Amino acid sequence: DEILPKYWYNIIPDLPKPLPPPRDPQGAYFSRIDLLRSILPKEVLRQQFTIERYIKIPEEVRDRYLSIGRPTPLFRAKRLEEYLKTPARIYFKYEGATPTGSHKINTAIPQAYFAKEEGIEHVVTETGAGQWGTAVALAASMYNMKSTIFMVKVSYEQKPMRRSIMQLYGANVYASPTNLTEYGRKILETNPQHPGSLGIAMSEAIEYALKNEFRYLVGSVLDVVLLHQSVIGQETITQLDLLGEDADILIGCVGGGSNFGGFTYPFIGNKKGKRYIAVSSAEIPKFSKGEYKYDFPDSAGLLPLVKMITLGKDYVPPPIYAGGLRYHGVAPTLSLLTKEGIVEWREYNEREIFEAAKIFIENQGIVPAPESAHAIRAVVDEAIEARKNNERKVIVFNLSGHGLLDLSNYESMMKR
Amino acid sequence: GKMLVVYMTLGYPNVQSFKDFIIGAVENGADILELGIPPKYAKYDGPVIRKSYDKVKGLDIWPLIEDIRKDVGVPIIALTYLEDWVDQLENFLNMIKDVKLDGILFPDLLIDYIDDLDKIDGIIKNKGLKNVIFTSPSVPDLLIHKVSKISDLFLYYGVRPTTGVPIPVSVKQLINRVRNLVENKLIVGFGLSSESDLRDALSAGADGIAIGTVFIEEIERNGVKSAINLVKKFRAILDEY
Ligand SMILES: *Cc1c(COP(=O)(O)O)cnc(C)c1O
Ligand SMILES: O=P(O)(O)OC[C@@H](O)CO
């Protein structure tokens, strides 16, 4: 059962081209790169810039990983193959198995460990849906630290269930834009009805941590996060090996890009598999309308400039969509890999992903996260192409979370 | 022995103090000089070197370079960002060559201009200039190995994202990652201001050290004599190998 990796894998040393580094803005009044040393736990920052191919997972972190149910299951979806009358075999790494219901726990656990080891005793972060907020509240609870979550205001109101779990673990949850940070009140001044965005909530979390000498935990985009997530892809390889299977098509959904890069990068770096499909929302068209430029992860501009596919730091998501994947940019490594042609990208609209989920609910049984139904949707379309081609394609996809706390979302999608 | 590579901003803090510092650096063990040409965007420079560019704003660098060149026997590399000159690359290189500089280090060559690496490296070598190629942990292992075969004089490897800012980073481990890939001399830089930070890299395989921000800080805190001092100290440490 030590299919659980001994190391995290960083793809950077194996990339086709160099990965442009984070960067202070031209003629900036303060150094963002220098500010990182206040924002991030020292060892998180060290892993973000001490780029090696492999990095030992501290044994205490491996122990915690095991205690939440790692390695996650690698299921075969045989009923689904039969329903699609496809000759392909369909497998999914089920990241919904962790207590929080998503893969985000994989980076919250080490980050929290490193902060507790450094003497931190209060962490802060943002969240949209609440998958990341819940991960961080559980991880903080594990290491006896307080947590403050800045939740995007509109999500705060439509998703009280996740708030309950975060508060249940011991977190305090505010609705960004709040008036607890300078950047919050600024946004309330100009439009006090503003429904928030991940970029705005990120900035208040960072501002709030600085103002109080807390630390900030980062849930996607940065390389240290996709490094931590590489437990997903490494287990999958080992688990496919146990089956004598070889992946052909690897599919993942993309918000900021951590579950995809955690899932596919061990495959890409070592030269396993062939065809990687990052799947995103048409209502947040990072890939179809985004722009590959240096830009801030957060909206205030408190983090360094980072080279990524982005709709723009001050992007505000569509008002009625309920499918997730609302963050405005893509991880720099993922952005590089897709611009360089190594990863394929695909966007789906809400109806398509909603139908995909019902297919999965009705022919596999797990209620998937709306996020993950983007991947399911591509899985289904590929299973059908393997049909009209007749080849035993093995499609492995990453089911990044369950949808049990997203039932209000599925109700909203009965409007299609 | 080990190479001590000393960076200073052209004209900093003023023309006659700069000349002072350089001369002292060279006399106290600097093997190579890298001299900064004030750019429009010091992309990969920390706040200390960015401020040092503001102070020398307006400097006429060419007559100055000719003064320095006249007395300094050591190799001198112009350091500046390719983005600011790519549209006038031939004239730029020809002016670098006119004022008798040995070569050039474009920090953003590999990172923002990778598709033109071979072309631009030919243009530079063709004109008889050393192309000192810049790398970091952001560059993949294979490419590091490739440019180590073409970089002139030494291959530069910066261990931190930006100069000056002391990002927590394991220098020992980044050097081991690349030591066997670099078929060259391997000069390490970015934030190597503490003996410990400097001795770590030497004993891990590095053939030399590059240092800049700590000199500017010294010049600003205590002055040029007190900074030439620091060169002596650093030369001493490298001399233990
Ligand atoms: C947050 C989330 C995502 C999108 O973020 P990534 O960084 O791409 O993983 C996808 N699926 C689930 C279940 C999420 O919680
Ligand atoms: O030692 P650093 O960090 O100031 O490096 C200076 C650079 O501009 C070139 O070495």
Q: Chain centroid to CA A97: how far?
A: 16
**Helices (H) then strands (E): counts for chain B:** 11, 9
Pair of tokens at residue B212? 């800049």
A45 CB neighbours in chain B (<8 A) are 167-168
Q: Taking a C-beta distance cutoff of 8 angstroms, is the pair A128, A135 a contact?
A: no
Pocket flag, ligand 2, residue B7 (CB < 6 Å): yes
Minimum Cα–Cα distance from A13: chain B residue: B140
How far is A314 from A182, CA to CA, in rounded Å? 17
Q: Taking a C-beta distance cutoff of 8 angstroms, is the pair A114, B168 a contact?
A: no
Pair of tokens at residue A118? 């450094």
Q: Taking a C-beta distance cutoff of 8 angstroms, is the pair A230, A330 a contact?
A: no
A17 CB neighbours in chain B (<8 A) are 114, 140, 143
Q: Taking a C-beta distance cutoff of 8 angstroms, is the pair A154, A196 a contact?
A: yes
Pocket flag, ligand 1, residue A255 (CB < 6 Å): yes
**Helices (H) then strands (E): counts for chain A:** 18, 14
The type of residue at B46 is G
Q: What is the resolution of the experimental data for this entry, in Å?
A: 2.5
Cα radius of gyration (chain A): 20
Cα A294-A230-A298 angle, rounded to 5 deg:
30
Pair of tokens at residue B222? 């205590």
DSSP B37-53: PP-S--TT--HHHHHHH
Which residue among B20, B27, B31, B34 is the active-site one? B34
Q: Check CB contact under 8 Å for B140 and A45.
A: no
Query: Alpha carbon of A327 to those of A280, A297, A313, B7, B235: distances in Å?
Result: 10, 9, 9, 41, 50
Q: Taking a C-beta distance cutoff of 8 angstroms, is the pair A388, A382 a contact?
A: no
Burial (CB < 10 A; 0-12, 13-18, 19+), residue B147, is buried
Query: Alpha carbon of A251 to those of A91, A389, B143, B185: distances in Å?
Result: 10, 19, 28, 43
Burial (CB < 10 A; 0-12, 13-18, 19+), residue A343, is buried
Query: Alpha carbon of A280 to those of A257, A283, A326, A342, A360: distances in Å?
Result: 10, 9, 9, 17, 18
Single out the residue of A270, A281, A277 nearest to residue A396, CA to CA. A277
Single out the residue of A359, A394, A397, A398 nearest to residue A88, CA to CA. A394
Would you kindly state where each structural domain of chain A is located, as residue ranges? 1-4+69-103+230-416, 5-68+104-229
Pocket test for ligand 1, best of A253, A328, A330 (most atoms within 8 A of CB): A253
Beta bridge partners of A150: A126, A174
Sort strands A306-310 and A291-295 into parallel, antiparallel or unpaired: antiparallel
Q: How many CB pairs under 8 A join A and B?
A: 90
Pair of tokens at residue A241? 């090996």
Q: Check CB contact under 8 Å for B168 and A46.
A: yes
Single out the residue of B119, A33, B98, B201 nearest to residue B106, CA to CA. B119
Single out the residue of A296, A27, A295 nearest to residue B45, CA to CA. A27
Q: How many CA atoms lie within 13 A of A345 on its CB side?
A: 23
Q: Check CB contact under 8 Å for A49 and B47.
A: no
Pair of tokens at residue B200? 């770590």
A53 CB neighbours in chain B (<8 A) are 141, 177
Is the previous residue joined to A317 through a cis bond, with omega within 30 degrees of 0? no
Minimum Cα–Cα distance from A20: chain B residue: B111
Beta bridge partners of A215: A123
In the three-class reduction of DSSP (H, G, I as helix; E, B as strand; rest coil), residue A324 is classed as coil
Q: Taking a C-beta distance cutoff of 8 angstroms, is the pair A310, A329 a contact?
A: yes
Q: Taking a C-beta distance cutoff of 8 angstroms, is the pair B78, B66 a contact?
A: no
Q: Which residues of A20-29 are buried (b: 16+ CB within 10 A; e: fewer)?
A: bbbbbbeeee
The type of residue at A6 is K
How far is A92 from A110, CA to CA, in rounded Å? 24
In the three-class reduction of DSSP (H, G, I as helix; E, B as strand; rest coil), residue B156 is classed as strand
Show Cβ contacts of residue A389 under 8 Å, excluding neighbours closer than 6 positions.
none
Which regions of B60-166 does DSSP assign to beta strands (E)? Answer: 76-79, 103-105, 130-131, 134-135, 155-158
| Angle in degrees, 0-180, between the axes of helices A231-242 and A258-269, rounded to the nearest 10 | 50
Single out the residue of B59, A272, B10, A142 nearest to residue A263, CA to CA. A272
In the three-class reduction of DSSP (H, G, I as helix; E, B as strand; rest coil), residue A398 is classed as strand
Report the CATH architecture of A5-68+104-229. 3-Layer(aba) Sandwich (3.40)
How far is A205 from A203, CA to CA, in rounded Å? 5
Ordered strands of the A146-152 beta sheet: A171-176, A146-152, A122-127, A215-216
Do A5-68+104-229 and A1-4+69-103+230-416 fall under one CATH topology?
yes
Q: Taking a C-beta distance cutoff of 8 angstroms, is the pair B156, B137 a contact?
A: no
Block residue for tokens 């902060």? A115
By residue range, what is the domain housing residue B229? 1-241
- In this structure, the dihedral spanned by the alpha carbons of residues A332, A335, A337 and A338, taken in order and rounded to 10 degrees, is 180
Work out how many domains chain B is built from and give that number. 1
Mutate to test the interface with A, among B116, B138, B146, B178 (most CBs of A within 10 A): B138
CATH of domain A1-4+69-103+230-416: 3.40.50.1100
Q: In terms of residues, how long is chain A?
A: 416
Single out the residue of A213, A37, A41 nearest to residue A111, CA to CA. A41
DSSP A60-83: HHHHHHHHTTPSPPEEE-HHHHHH
Single out the residue of A7, A21, A11 nearest to residue A342, CA to CA. A11
Q: In terms of residues, how long is chain B?
A: 241
Residues of A near B (Cβ–Cβ under 8 Å) read: 12-24, 26-27, 30-31, 33-34, 36-37, 42-43, 45-46, 49-53, 304
Single out the residue of B183, B126, B132 nearest to residue B153, CA to CA. B132
Neighbours of A248 (CB within 10 A): 18
Single out the residue of B54, B34, B13, B45 nearest to residue B217, CA to CA. B13
Which regions of A211-318 does DSSP assign to beta strands (E)? Answer: 215-216, 249-253, 276-281, 291-295, 306-310
Q: Taking a C-beta distance cutoff of 8 angstroms, is the pair A344, A276 a contact?
A: yes
Pocket flag, ligand 2, residue B107 (CB < 6 Å): no
How far is A3 from A306, CA to CA, in rounded Å? 34
Identify the helix (H) or strand (E) that includes residue A310.
strand A306-310
DSSP B63-79: HHHHHHHHH--S-EEEE
B40 CB neighbours in chain A (<8 A) are 26
Could you confirm whether B45 is annotated as catalytic?
Answer: yes
Mutate to test the interface with B, among A51, A223, A271, A335 (most CBs of B within 10 A): A51
Identify the helix (H) or strand (E) that includes residue B97.
helix B89-98
How far is A153 from A151, CA to CA, in rounded Å? 6
Distance B44 CA to ligand 2 centre (A): 10
Mark residue A69 as left, alpha or beta (left: phi above 0; alpha: psi -120 to 50; beta: remaining).
Answer: left
Cα A132-A135-A138 angle, rounded to 5 deg:
150
